[PDB]
Ligand binder design. Structure first.
Ligand SMILES: CNC(=O)c1cccc(-c2ccc3c(c2)N(C(=O)c2ccco2)C[C@H](C)N3C(C)=O)c1
Length: 126
């Protein structure tokens, strides 16, 4: 069972805009979560071949990771801030869906989600 390709991260046909909200998502939210001690498993797609998890992509049909989110922001892939926020939410919930409650990786994602919510609290107005 091969890994799927990573989510798309750049599309020259998508329109581009700079907004206060998207700038904040890259410069504050993503940068803060990226440097966190628990960020490392989330910095690239789950490599289920390397990890011998043949049911990962049978269970998780909407993968997402922070490496993808970073690339999407840098490539002006998102038009609405909510698209980015949804991707963060998908990342965290994928981790809760697949892994056992109480596992280290779950507590890691929970800490990262709490930080994310503290950072999103101060998102600029639309
Ligand atoms: C560059 N490679 C890595 O950063 C890397 C190396 C070894 C393992 C991992 C890793 C990546 C993703 C995950 C886990 C481990 N997982 C772990 O259980 C785990 C335990 C402790 C840290 O990660 C399995 C699970 C599928 N998972 C997530 C994000 O849900 C990532």
């Amino acid at each position: 069972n091969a890994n799927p390709p990573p989510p798309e991260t750049s599309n020259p046909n998508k329109p581009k805009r700079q907004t206060n909200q998207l700038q904040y998502l890259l410069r504050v939210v993503l940068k803060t979560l990226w440097k966190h001690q628990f960020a490392w498993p989330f910095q690239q797609p789950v490599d289920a071949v390397k990890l011998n998890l043949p049911d990962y992509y049978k269970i998780i049909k909407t993968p997402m990771d922070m490496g993808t989110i970073k690339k999407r922001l840098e490539n002006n892939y998102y038009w609405n801030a909510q698209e980015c926020i949804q991707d963060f939410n998908t990342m965290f919930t994928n981790c809760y869906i697949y892994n056992k409650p109480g596992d280290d990786i779950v507590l890691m994602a929970e800490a990262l989600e709490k930080l994310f919510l503290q950072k999103i609290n101060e998102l600029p107005t639309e």
